[PDB]
Curated annotation (Swiss-Prot):
GO terms for cellular component: endoplasmic reticulum membrane. Changing residue 3 to L: In AH3; non-classic form; 50% steroid 21-monooxygenase activity. Changing residue 366 to C: In AH3; very low residual activity. This is Steroid 21-hydroxylase. It comes from Homo sapiens (Human).
Length: 442
């Protein structure tokens, strides 16, 4: 009993792949097989099927596949995000996860506060001007992850311009069609590809960045004490966990931690531009509690619910990452053979009317206490949960909390920014370019 096979091939060509995938549940239910590219792959479109796979049968669906680009990004050192589930992988995740949690425990909260403080002051420079916020949230969250991974040396040797430019190049190349098409149609590897050589140049530049940073930490490090995440990770190292593991864990922190959180922030802005009743309510809630520390989260319940909603309705990683079946198993009473690739449709699953009534509507009050509905999972779940989720949820709180108290968000000009996501971009859910006006005071 395999999951039902949906007819057709090259479904890839559909714009809004996660919303098209939700469309096939019409005939085939939450769990079905379909041919993306050449390959047969099962897709999950419900919170039940996703949690049943990822949480319940924990180890059965914790793997990753290995198409061309996965090998290509990690020819020197092992990658964490694209690494298959093993003992060595589990230690890999544990270390970098302890680096985020314990390593920067005292500094994570102040680094965020201070950097977003300077963001608001840069916003201050042009009071009426329409601002291309997207890039400004991108520089913020990139600076934050850089400072927390690499330390003081960033604003000293003035490394932020060159690092941002590198981090951006790397993701932007990799997620583009000319590179992604090779993972699904692997015979295309033999036909010449400028794109893949644009990628190799980006890999080379990111590897030079991380490695120079790695040397400089090693030579200055103190045996008991840790300044940032690389200090912590270097110290918990040396199938043993090597310095190559640290190198890639930094790569995953950098690339994983800019565009994801920054775009979520951008989406929140667009939603508030469409909902100025909510903006005022949020502002008036902030006025009633001169910053709010992250320790005082409970004290802003509507703000938290608004963040939860942004995550529900617009998850920035809408298809998560592909999963691989580690041993023969089953989801929803269908036989799942070993090595079959699983696509966890998070955007689709959050649009379920079974779970979230009026599921297409930006409705923050939905997450408020009477009859509160089930928690969304924009960060995924199980063994493969987003590594930088704590850092992200902090960044989201501090940045919106300070933007709203210090400013009012007005539309760029006459018409509100398009809420519809860019069509062919699935990897990162990005919105159509927009400007916003920031006017003191909230
Ligand atoms: C709103 C912000 C963010 C969202 C919605 C988000 C979402 C996700 C999702 C859905 C996955 C894949 C889950 C799966 O494979 O089942 C993921 C993986 C990951 N994320 Fe994030 N993420 C966010 C921010 C960050 C940040 C800030 C970092 C790092 C600083 C980060 C690092 C990672 C890493 C390293 C993985 C791979 C983990 C693994 O493969 O097990 N993410 N994230
Ligand atoms: C949310 C997500 O999925 C992530 O942001 C979390 C981890 C991210 C990896 C990290 C390493 C990497 C190395 C490269 O040189 C190309 C781009 C990737 C594959 C990069 C893309 C986006 C990922 C997959």
């Amino acid at each position: 009993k395999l999951p039902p096979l949906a007819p057709g091939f090259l479904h890839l060509l559909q714009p809004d792949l996660p919303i098209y995938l939700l469309g096939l549940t019409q005939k085939f239910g939450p769990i079905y097989r379909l041919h993306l590219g050449l390959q047969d792959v099962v897709v999950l479109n419900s919170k039940r099927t996703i949690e049943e796979a990822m949480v319940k049968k924990w180890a059965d669906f914790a793997g990753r596949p290995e198409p061309l680009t996965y090998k290509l990004v990690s020819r020197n050192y092992p990658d964490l995000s694209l690494g298959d589930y093993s003992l060595l992988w589990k230690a890999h995740k544990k270390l970098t996860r302890s680096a985020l949690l314990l390593g920067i425990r005292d500094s994570m909260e102040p680094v965020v506060e201070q950097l977003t403080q300077e963001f608001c002051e840069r916003m201050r420079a042009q009071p009426g001007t329409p601002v291309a916020i997207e890039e400004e949230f991108s520089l913020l969250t990139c600076s934050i992850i850089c400072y927390l991974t690499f330390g003081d040396k960033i604003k000293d040797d003035n490394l932020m311009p060159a690092y941002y430019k590198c981090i951006q190049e790397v993701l932007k190349t990799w997620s583009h069609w000319s590179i992604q098409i090779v993972d699904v149609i692997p015979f295309l590897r033999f036909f010449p590809n400028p794109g893949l050589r644009r990628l190799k140049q980006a890999i080379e530049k990111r590897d030079h960045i991380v490695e120079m940073q790695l040397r400089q930490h090693k030579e200055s490090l103190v045996a008991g004490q840790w300044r940032d995440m690389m200090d912590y990770m270097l110290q918990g190292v040396a199938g043993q966990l090597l310095e190559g593991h640290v190198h890639m864990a930094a790569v995953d922190l950098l690339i994983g931690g800019t565009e994801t959180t920054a775009n979520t922030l951008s989406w929140a802005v667009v939603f508030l531009l469409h909902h100025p009743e909510i903006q005022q309510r949020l502002q008036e809630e902030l006025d009633h509690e001169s910053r709010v520390p992250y320790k005082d989260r409970a004290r802003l319940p509507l703000l938290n619910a608004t963040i939860a909603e942004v995550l529900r309705l617009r998850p920035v990683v809408p298809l998560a990452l592909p999963h691989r079946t580690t041993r023969p198993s089953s989801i929803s009473g269908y036989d799942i053979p070993e090595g079959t690739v699983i696509i966890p449709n998070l955007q689709g699953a959050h649009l379920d009317e079974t779970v979230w009534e009026r599921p297409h509507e930006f409705w923050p009050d939905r997450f408020l206490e009477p009859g509160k509905n089930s928690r969304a999972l924009a960060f995924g779940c199980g063994a493969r949960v987003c590594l930088g989720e704590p850092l992200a949820r902090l960044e989201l709180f501090v940045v919106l909390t300070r933007l709203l108290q210090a400013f009012t968000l007005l539309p760029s000009g006459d018409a509100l920014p398009s809420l519809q996501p860019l069509p062919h971009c699935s990897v990162i859910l990005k919105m159509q370019p927009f400007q916003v006006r920031l006017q003191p005071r909230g």
